[PDB]
């Protein structure tokens, strides 16, 4: 008997940035699950680029009381609301047994922030560069005032 969970490891989904999905499958049965296949067709390639990992993965065997973790790195190509539906898992509970079909947890509907909106909310070095840009406004009077004072004080 396999228990499987799907989790989104990113605190924020952002257009054009890496989106990391982790799949954890736990065998809680007394016997080993055979021919364990995980398939997640929820991510069409037109809206998500695969950077790393697989939406489809097979394992020959998961020992009893053992677990397997799979991680996929995607890149959302469009901003918007996306429904992270459950992936499908198939496995054999016994040799020559019927194929058992299971589903992972569904993280549900998440918002993919537009890159511009993400930067608007969370954009560091901008201040580092900006600090110097403000100095020139007062260069002349700042020097002249004290120079005159020293010449007369």
């Amino acid at each position: 008997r396999l228990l499987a969970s799907k989790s989104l490891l990113n605190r924020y989904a952002v257009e054009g940035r890496d989106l990391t999905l982790q799949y954890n499958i736990y065998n809680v049965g007394s016997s080993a699950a055979l021919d364990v296949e995980l398939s997640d067709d929820s991510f069409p390639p037109e809206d998500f680029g695969i950077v790393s990992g697989m939406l489809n993965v097979k394992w020959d065997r998961i020992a009893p009381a053992s677990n397997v973790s799979h991680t996929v790195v995607l890149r959302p190509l469009k901003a918007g609301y996306f429904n992270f539906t459950s992936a499908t898992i198939t496995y054999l509970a016994q040799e020559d047994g019927p194929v058992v079909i299971g589903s992972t947890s569904a993280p549900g509907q998440g918002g993919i922030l537009a890159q511009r909106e993400f930067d608007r909310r969370f954009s560091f070095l901008d201040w580092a560069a900006f600090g110097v840009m403000t100095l020139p406004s007062i260069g002349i009077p700042l020097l002249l005032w004290y120079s005159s004072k020293r010449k007369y004080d």
């Binding site: 993965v57 397997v68 991680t71 600090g131």
Partner: protein, 142 residues
């Protein structure tokens, strides 16, 4: 067994500790064998901890991933040792026997180089300079 494994490694490591809780390491390998054996199971060992290796959708693509606390994911080279089923079984036997695990040759190793992981200040500086300017004005007018 895979004769003369030819590997093309590609790896990724989290660079930013502000947006992640843990440093994740991802190593992808394409394996090609002289005898064209396909669909072998591989096992990875990193620092004596074994991690499951997944098979890619494409033949000969394999991926292993592990995470570490940002404090423990020091900058440096992490050697990922990959084992076949036979050498993996020997490794598990030696580990159970507290035998020297270094005697068991890995099928191949992959070196993963990990490099490691204002408005308040602007107001403060402007405030302090303005406050001293106010003191200057008082002295000037005093």
């Amino acid at each position: 067994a895979c004769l003369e494994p030819q590997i093309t490694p590609s790896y990724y490591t989290t660079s930013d500790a502000v947006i992640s809780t843990e440093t994740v390491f991802i190593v992808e390998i394409s394996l090609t064998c002289k005898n064209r054996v396909q669909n072998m199971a591989l096992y990875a060992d990193v620092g004596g901890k074994q991690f499951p290796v997944t098979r890619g959708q494409d033949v000969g693509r394999y991926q292993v991933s592990w995470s570490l606390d940002h404090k423990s994911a020091h900058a440096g080279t992490y050697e990922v040792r990959f084992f076949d089923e036979e050498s993996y079984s020997l490794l598990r036997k030696a580990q159970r026997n507290n035998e020297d695990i270094s005697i068991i040759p890995p099928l191949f190793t992959v070196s993963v180089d990990h490099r490691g992981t204002t408005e308040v200040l602007a107001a403060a500086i402007g405030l302090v300079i303005y406050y001293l300017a106010f003191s200057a004005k008082s002295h000037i007018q005093a």
